[PDB]
Amino acid sequence: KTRYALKDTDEEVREFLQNNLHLQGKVEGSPSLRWQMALYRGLPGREEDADDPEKIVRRVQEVSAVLYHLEQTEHPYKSKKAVWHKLLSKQRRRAVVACFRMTPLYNLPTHRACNMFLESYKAAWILTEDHSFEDRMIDDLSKAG
Amino acid sequence: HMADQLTEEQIAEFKEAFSLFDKDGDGTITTKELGTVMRSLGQNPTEAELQDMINEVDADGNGTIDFPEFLTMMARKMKDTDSEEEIREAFRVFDKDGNGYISAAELRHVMTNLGEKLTDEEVDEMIREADIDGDGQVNYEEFVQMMTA
Amino acid sequence: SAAETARRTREFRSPPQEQINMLLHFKDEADEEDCPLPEDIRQDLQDFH
Ligand SMILES: [Ca+2]
Ligand SMILES: [Ca+2]
Numbered sequence: 001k002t003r004y005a006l007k008d009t010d011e012e013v014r015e016f017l018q019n020n021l022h023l024q025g026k027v028e029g030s031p032s033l034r035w036q037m038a039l040y041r042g043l044p045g046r047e048e049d050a051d052d053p054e055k056i057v058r059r060v061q062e063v064s065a066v067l068y069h070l071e072q073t074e075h076p077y078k079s080k081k082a083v084w085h086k087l088l089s090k091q092r093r094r095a096v097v098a099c100f101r102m103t104p105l106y107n108l109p110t111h112r113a114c115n116m117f118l119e120s121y122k123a124a125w126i127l128t129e130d131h132s133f134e135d136r137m138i139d140d141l142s143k144a145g
Numbered sequence: 146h147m148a149d150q151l152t153e154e155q156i157a158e159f160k161e162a163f164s165l166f167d168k169d170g171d172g173t174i175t176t177k178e179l180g181t182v183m184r185s186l187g188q189n190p191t192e193a194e195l196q197d198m199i200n201e202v203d204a205d206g207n208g209t210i211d212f213p214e215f216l217t218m219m220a221r222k223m224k225d226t227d228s229e230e231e232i233r234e235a236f237r238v239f240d241k242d243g244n245g246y247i248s249a250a251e252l253r254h255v256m257t258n259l260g261e262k263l264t265d266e267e268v269d270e271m272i273r274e275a276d277i278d279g280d281g282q283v284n285y286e287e288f289v290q291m292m293t294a
Numbered sequence: 295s296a297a298e299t300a301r302r303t304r305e306f307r308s309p310p311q312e313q314i315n316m317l318l319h320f321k322d323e324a325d326e327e328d329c330p331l332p333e334d335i336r337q338d339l340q341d342f343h
């Protein structure tokens with residue numbers, strides 16, 4: 001399941017299990033496995049020949065893939081990514097609504113549009129204009145006639 | 146403010162209405178002037194209530210209604226019409242088509258117009274949060290109780 | 295066209311003062327891309343300037 005969390009294909013997990021077949025639990029080291037193994041071995045169709053290295057890795061890989069994707073569904077873990085965030089809406093929701101109902105320029109009265117033009121024209125065309133007259137003015141005033 | 150509540154056209158219309166009440170043109174509304182227009186509309190009130198409906202809007206207490214007080218009355222009337230319906234317009238901004246549900250494409254349309262951009266996948270993240278029913282659309286009832294999409 | 299229609303309709307979703315600010319922003323010749331005015335209309339303002 002950890003390998004599936006690391007985005008591995010079905011072949012990668014199988015070869016990972018092939019090299020890690022010795023990490024399966026030991027019945028002596030765990031009290032829980034004592035009764036589970038006894039209950040597991042009591043089934044009618046359980047043959048010890050079915051515990052082949054290939055048969056073990058196939059069933060573990062199939063179940064692990066199902067188990068991994070199952071908990072991705074029940075626990076989407078998509079929280080803490082986009083939580084309830086109120087970016088600016090709770091105070092700026094009136095602005096975004098006002099944006100979609102903003103009056104276009106061609107619907108304004110002519111006199112109102114002209115006043116807006118004068119403010120825009122002076123800031124972008126008159127203020128931005130460069131006229132250097134200080135040097136010329138001082139030179140003219142410094143001459144005796 | 147009056148500029149926020151009223152437009153230039155509305156101010157002109159209110160001035161004409163004020164001049165309709167003020168036949169004299171002195172700039173003030175008296176009880177007889179107010180009473181005269183009420184009789185033209187059918188009502189026949191007494192001076193007791195006629196004074197009361199003047200004092201209810203008369204600010205300086207001079208006993209007469211001038212245009213600044215008349216505009217202030219109309220400004221309140223325009224403002225208090227909407228109390229909590231501001232969420233209705235907010236819902237319609239997300240609801241382009243005009244039905245009672247917010248679709249993911251409609252949520253894309255408003256998000257496209259806004260500054261922030263979505264990668265066509267996280268749009269499903271917040272719509273499923275807002276949509277409790279799981280039908281893929283956020284209705285008006287789901288929007289007011291909790292707003293995320 | 296496609297989603298970038300928002301860029302073209304950005305003018306109509308802006309206050310009228312901002313709309314006319316964008317229209318007149320063609321003086322420095324480095325802003326002839328955001329301004330959507332035709333060249334003939336641009337010439338009249340430059341002639342008056
Ligand atoms: Ca009068
Ligand atoms: Ca008064």
Ligand SMILES: [Ca+2]
Nearest residue numbers: 242246247248
């Ligand atoms: Ca809709």
Ligand SMILES: [Ca+2]
Nearest residue numbers: 276278282284
């Ligand atoms: Ca729903």
